[PDB]
């Protein structure tokens, strides 16, 4: 099903698992990538910033993350960098799959609500921004237009 | 103010004592 | 902006309206140089290309007019020449100059002669498996050379195997 159906934040927040059952598991494999043993003790820190409030299905998160981290293997399976996707798909989403009668939909998935200007991804690298490329590929699989932002890094 | 250029004008003046611009430079000394 | 081109002692360049003519011992070439707000004039010993605008599009044409004029200076004195080489693998290609067009016969065995008409005062002198296209108008000479090579173009089959044709060997 197309993102057209769920990318907008026009519906009430729907996240109370005590009143919602049958919620599909998330497809997001990990949130901490790279050298998670080490702490952000890197020279450069780039972030992928969302430029519009939107809902991002756990579907897109996984594909976006994979496409970025799977690529960050331009540095190697045990390369020196740490990757972080800071958002989690809390918003439960429905579908009315009778016509408009008793239409309250059944749970079909989950999505994460991101407000314009928040960073969804944050990578930590030594002067070796292959990460800037890992993100050109990442904002490629999420609905919004995005800003690739570098923070600690005056090594231009 | 490149230093290597400053050192060359010296080395050149030294051999003169015992690039073209750098030679013309030393000569001017 | 304004650029000044000192015309060669060997040449005389006159210009009325948007047309410039350049005459030398080797001939004469006239061109139209028309572009928004770019004035081209002959100030005695030098040709002047000037304009009150400096935007990218304007500078582009100014630079183009320059090379066009210098190219004319060169064409009326030293002249322009392109060298070509006829080549064949099985069928003896026959390239002849007949009238104001060069004709090529027996190309890849073809019964129908392939031809093209020469541009302007361009001389196509052919000697054996060598051709020389020359004249004072680089535009004309360049095309005549090109057309000759294009004349043997093949799309139907693999060019890497069927390499017959005439090719530009030396560019001025």
């Amino acid at each position: 099903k197309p993102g057209a159906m769920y990318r907008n934040s026009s519906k009430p927040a729907y996240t109370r698992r005590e009143y919602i059952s049958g919620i599909p598991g998330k497809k997001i494999a990990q949130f901490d990538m790279g050298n998670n043993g080490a702490g952000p003790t890197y020279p450069a820190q780039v972030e992928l910033v969302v430029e519009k409030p939107v809902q991002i299905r756990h579907n897109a998160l996984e594909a976006a993350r994979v496409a970025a981290n799977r690529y960050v293997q331009n540095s190697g399976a045990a390369a020196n960098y740490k990757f972080r996707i800071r958002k989690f798909p809390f918003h439960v989403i429905r579908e009315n799959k009778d016509g408009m009668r008793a239409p309250f939909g059944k749970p079909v998935g989950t999505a994460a609500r991101v407000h314009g200007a928040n960073h969804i991804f944050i990578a930590w690298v030594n002067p070796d921004p292959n990460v800037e490329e890992a993100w050109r590929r990442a904002k490629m699989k999420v609905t919004p237009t995005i800003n690739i932002d570098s923070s600690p890094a005056g090594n231009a | 103010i490149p230093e290597w250029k400053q050192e060359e004008v010296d080395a050149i003046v030294e051999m003169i004592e015992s690039r073209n611009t750098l030679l013309e430079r030393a000569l001017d000394d | 902006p304004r650029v000044e081109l000192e015309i060669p002692e060997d040449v005389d360049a006159e210009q009325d309206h948007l047309d410039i003519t350049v005459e030398g011992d080797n001939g004469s070439v006239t061109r139209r140089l028309w572009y928004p707000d770019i004035d081209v004039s002959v100030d005695g010993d030098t040709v002047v290309i000037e304009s009150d605008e400096d935007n990218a599009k304007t500078m582009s044409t100014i630079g183009t007019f320059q090379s066009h004029i210098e190219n004319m200076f060169h064409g009326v004195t030293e002249g322009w020449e392109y060298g070509m080489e006829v080549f064949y693998s099985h069928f003896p290609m026959q390239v002849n100059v007949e009238g104001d067009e060069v004709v090529i016969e027996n190309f890849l065995g073809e019964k129908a002669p392939r031809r093209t008409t020469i541009h302007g005062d361009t001389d196509v002198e052919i000697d054996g498996e060598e051709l020389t296209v020359s004249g004072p108008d680089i535009e004309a000479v360049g095309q005549t050379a090109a057309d000759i090579e294009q004349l043997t173009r093949i799309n139907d089959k693999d060019v890497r195997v069927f390499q017959d044709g005439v090719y530009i060997t030396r560019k001025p």
């Binding site: - | - | 028309w34 572009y35 707000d37 004035d39």
Partner: protein
């Protein structure tokens, strides 16, 4: 043949629409106008899109009909007609007191209206009505 024009306008190198707009205004004021050298009138823009528009007008039509002129003659006159309420009595009277000519059948040289002249030295993107008609298939009778 013979047209007592109170005003003879020269369209050579002028913006068709700006001339037409003035010739319209004047004919509605009771003036008899003649536009000369229509073939040399001009319209700014990219020749390719300009021609597509007029070509589309030629192709448009059906049994009821959409007679669109091909000669620079009519193109210009139709242009003026669009600036007049030609179906009203007053409009038709004005329109009928305006005539466009290929070249100049008069002795006098027409006048150039203010703000209608195009400077060829500072303009390269424009076309001649004559060129448009040639593209449309007109018979260059000028």
């Amino acid at each position: 043949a013979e047209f007592d024009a109170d005003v003879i306008v020269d369209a050579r190198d002028c913006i068709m629409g700006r001339v037409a707009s003035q010739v319209a205004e004047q004919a509605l004021d009771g003036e008899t106008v003649a536009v000369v050298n229509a073939e040399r009138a001009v319209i700014t823009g990219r020749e390719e899109q300009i021609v597509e528009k007029y070509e589309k007008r030629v192709d448009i039509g059906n049994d009821n009909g959409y007679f669109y002129p091909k000669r620079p003659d009519g193109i210009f006159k139709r242009t003026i007609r669009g600036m007049l309420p030609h179906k009203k009595q007053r409009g038709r009277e004005a329109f009928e007191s305006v005539r466009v000519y290929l070249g100049n059948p008069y002795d006098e040289d027409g006048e150039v209206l203010d703000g209608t002249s195009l400077d060829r030295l500072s303009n390269i993107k424009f076309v001649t009505l004559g060129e448009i008609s040639e593209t449309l298939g007109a018979n260059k009778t000028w």
